[PDB]
Amino acid sequence: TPSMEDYIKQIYMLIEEKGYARVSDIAEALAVHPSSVTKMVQKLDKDEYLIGLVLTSKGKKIGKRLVYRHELLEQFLRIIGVDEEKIYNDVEGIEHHLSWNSIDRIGDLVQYFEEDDARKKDLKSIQK
Amino acid sequence: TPSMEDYIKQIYMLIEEKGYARVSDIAEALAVHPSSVTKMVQKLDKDEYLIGLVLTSKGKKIGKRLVYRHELLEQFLRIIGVDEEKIYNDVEGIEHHLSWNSIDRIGDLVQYFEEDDARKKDLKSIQK
Numbered sequence: 741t742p743s744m745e746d747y748i749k750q751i752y753m754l755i756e757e758k759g760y761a762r763v764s765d766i767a768e769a770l771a772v773h774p775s776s777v778t779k780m781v782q783k784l785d786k787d788e789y790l791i792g793l794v795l796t797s798k799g800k801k802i803g804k805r806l807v808y809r810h811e812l813l814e815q816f817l818r819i820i821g822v823d824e825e826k827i828y829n830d831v832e833g834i835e836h837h838l839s840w841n842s843i844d845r846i847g848d849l850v851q852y853f854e855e856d857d858a859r860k861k862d863l864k865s866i867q868k
Numbered sequence: 869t870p871s872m873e874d875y876i877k878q879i880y881m882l883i884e885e886k887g888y889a890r891v892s893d894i895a896e897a898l899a900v901h902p903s904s905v906t907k908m909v910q911k912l913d914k915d916e917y918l919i920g921l922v923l924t925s926k927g928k929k930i931g932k933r934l935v936y937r938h939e940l941l942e943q944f945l946r947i948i949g950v951d952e953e954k955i956y957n958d959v960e961g962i963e964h965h966l967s968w969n970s971i972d973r974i975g976d977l978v979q980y981f982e983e984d985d986a987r988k989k990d991l992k993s994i995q996k
């Protein structure tokens with residue numbers, strides 16, 4: 741689910757940032773009460789994404805994938821000229837509704853612009 | 869809301885297709901129970917999107933924009949080479965989570981590829 745992915749992402753990011761994931765930090769990162777974190781952490785444990793709390797290899801794999809996908813979509817929206825202020829909220833929504841196929845094709849397109857700057861200028865010219 | 873956008877879009881599409889929007893057709897289009905439809909219909913009436921379901925001018929403007937947005941994003945995923953079978957499901961989800969700014973820039977991106985087929989060919993080459 742979207743929520744589960746939001747949690748796994750924030751947990752992975754805290755562990756990379758701090759070395760551990762506190763319930764209070766997850767709650768602060770997701771703007772939720774810790775009782776919701778506690779209840780969700782018990783599901784993630786049940787579904788073997790985690791064992792403070794430690795991500796299993798399964799949990800680590802998904803976390804890293806979600807971070808990559810967020811970063812990819814940010815650079816996609818940035819490349820096509822979306823106002824920087826708007827990018828995060830858009831990515832945070834759309835990330836959960838894109839198939840791997842779309843993600844990978846968005847990947848190729850990001851690569852398409854990056855390998856020749858003229859392409860970027862031509863895209864900019866249309867926006868005029 | 870996302871749900872409200874789904875309903876307004878489907879109502880607009882039925883009126884364009886058939887000339888009218890019956891609650892039973894709405895229910896089938898969204899695969900929901902009629903009571904869910906009637907609840908949203910009253911909400912849309914209260915919010916002056918509609919009044920024998922008839923869109924007010926406010927309702928038509930939004931309906932037309934939502935149909936446009938859907939088509940645009942289908943075209944976007946299609947151009948970048950997403951498997952046709954996967955496109956509709958992805959668009960159905962992301963359409964609610966993109967700012968107008970993102971939609972406009974995606975519009976520019978679609979225009980970018982549509983105006984020179986060589987650009988499409990160059991993108992497909994990268995995909996190899």
Ligand SMILES: [Mn+2]
Nearest residue numbers: 746832833835
């Ligand atoms: Mn998110």
Ligand SMILES: [Mn+2]
Nearest residue numbers: 874960961963
């Ligand atoms: Mn939808």
